[PDB]
UniProtKB/Swiss-Prot annotation:
One Pfam family, short name: Lys
PANTHER family documented for this protein: LYSOZYME C
Source species: Gallus gallus (Chicken)
GO biological process, one term: defense response to Gram-negative bacterium
Name of the protein in its database record: Lysozyme C
Domain C-type lysozyme as annotated: residue spans: 1-129
Gene: LYZ
One GO location term (cellular component): cytoplasm
Length: 129
């Protein structure tokens, strides 16, 4: 599924991401824009041989099992394919584990490089929330 911007903001808020571990909702929408272009089906190979999956591009080295990443953990206890659903529940629950770890949202390379330090609020402008 390719979400609209305000559609995804509403779904992330419903699932409890607004101000989760101190990160406002625009941060989570901006990360999704630059990680996946709002597309649940997005998949991208990493140079280390792992792969990133779904709306928030969650990695197979530590977080999910995709069957093809040697020496890897599955800390969210899920098949990586679960992260491609039109239902974002799996992506959200895994993200809540990642963001609690200690590095916060710096775990997402696109957030650090394109969202951090910008007017992220702009990503929810016009939305009835
Ligand atoms: Na894995």
């Amino acid at each position: 599924k390719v979400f609209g911007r305000c559609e995804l903001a509403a779904a992330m808020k419903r699932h409890g991401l607004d101000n989760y571990r101190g990160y406002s909702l625009g941060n989570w929408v901006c990360a999704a824009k630059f990680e996946s272009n709002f597309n649940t089906q997005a998949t991208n190979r990493n140079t280390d041989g792992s792969t990133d999956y779904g709306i928030l591009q969650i990695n197979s080295r530590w977080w999910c099992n995709d069957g093809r990443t040697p020496g890897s953990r599955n800390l969210c206890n899920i098949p990586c394919s679960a992260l491609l659903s039109s239902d974002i529940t799996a992506s959200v629950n895994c993200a809540k584990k990642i963001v609690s770890d200690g590095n916060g949202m710096n775990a997402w390379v696109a957030w650090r490089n394109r969202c951090k330090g910008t007017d992220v609020q702009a990503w929810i402008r016009g939305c009835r929330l």
